[PDB]
Amino acid sequence: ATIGRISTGSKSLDKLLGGGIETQAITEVFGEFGSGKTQLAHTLAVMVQLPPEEGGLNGSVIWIDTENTFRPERIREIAQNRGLDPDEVLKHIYVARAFNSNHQMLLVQQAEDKIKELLNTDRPVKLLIVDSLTSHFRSEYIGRGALAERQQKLAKHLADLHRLANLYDIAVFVTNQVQHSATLRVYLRKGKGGKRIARLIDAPHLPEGEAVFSITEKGIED
Numbered sequence: 754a755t756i757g758r759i760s761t762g763s764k765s766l767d768k769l770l771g772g773g774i775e776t777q778a779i780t781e782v783f784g785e786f787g788s789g790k791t792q793l794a795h796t797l798a799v800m801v802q803l804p805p806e807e808g809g810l811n812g813s814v815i816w817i818d819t820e821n822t823f824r825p826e827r828i829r830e831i832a833q834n835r836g837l838d839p840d841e842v843l844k845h846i847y848v849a850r851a852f853n854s855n856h857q858m859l860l861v862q863q864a865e866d867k868i869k870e871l872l873n874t875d876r877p878v879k880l881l882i883v884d885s886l887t888s889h890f891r892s893e894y895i896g897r898g899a900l901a902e903r904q905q906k907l908a909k910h911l912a913d914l915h916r917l918a919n920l921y922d923i924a925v926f927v928t929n930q931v932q933h934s935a936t937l938r939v940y941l942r943k944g945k946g947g948k949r950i951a952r953l954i955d956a957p958h959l960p961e962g963e964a965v966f967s968i969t970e971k972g973i974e975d
């Protein structure tokens with residue numbers, strides 16, 4: 754019942770987040786193309802595998818990929834440069850490509866089976882990524898009347914995700930490209946000098962500053 758926190762790799766971003774992204778919660782990162790959403794996802798997929806005194810949860814990962822932007826060699830690089838075995842780290846990320854939004858929804862149901870399989874194991878699922886949460890919905894539900902229909906399907910999908918996060922004490926991390934029912938929304942944008950900036954949105958009771966980070970051979974870090 755106590756929540757867990759997964760470090761992002763960036764001390765700055767971690768502080769903004771109160772220590773890292775939370776289990777029993779959906780964290781949505783949103784921003785324009787190139788703002789670092791997928792790179793943050795790759796980094797979290799390594800960080801969660803660390804022990805807790807290093808900011809992880811000794812956990813496995815389920816990743817639902819909608820745009821085929823998952824890169825196993827990037828996982829291996831991030832792992833290697835953080836002192837972890839690249840191939841063991843990869844072994845604990847279960848990637849499924851979602852062919853369309855309906856398949857994406859079924860995949861969340863299959864994720865529950867894998868979650869059960871690894872539960873009470875030494876590396877239970879502690880992170881579930883959906884990258885991108887919205888891309889299929891955006892292409893499939895379009896035109897007059899689509900707004901209500903799309904929002905309803907997305908709400909159902911997010912309800913499924915919330916249930917997994919809460920039932921099994923998992924952190925859910927979803928991405929959304931810009932030009933809501935997530936627990937926490939984090940807006941990401943590219944700044945000067947290769948920096949990325951993060952801001953919490955519509956969360957008046959949480960830190961109101963901005964975090965600043967870089968994307969490196971370690972994934973994300975200050």
Ligand SMILES: Nc1ncnc2c1ncn2[C@@H]1O[C@H](COP(=O)(O)OP(=O)(O)OP(=O)(O)O)[C@@H](O)[C@H]1O
Pocket residue numbers: 784785786787788789790791792793930968969970
């Ligand atoms: N190995 C690396 N080292 C340093 N920077 C990198 C590396 N790989 C990617 N990047 C940076 O990450 C950027 C891409 O970030 P990312 O794919 O997370 O964007 P995104 O927000 O997911 O975009 P979209 O919405 O288009 O999918 C690149 O333009 C580059 O600046």
Ligand SMILES: [Mg+2]
Pocket residue numbers: 790791792822
């Ligand atoms: Mg991306």
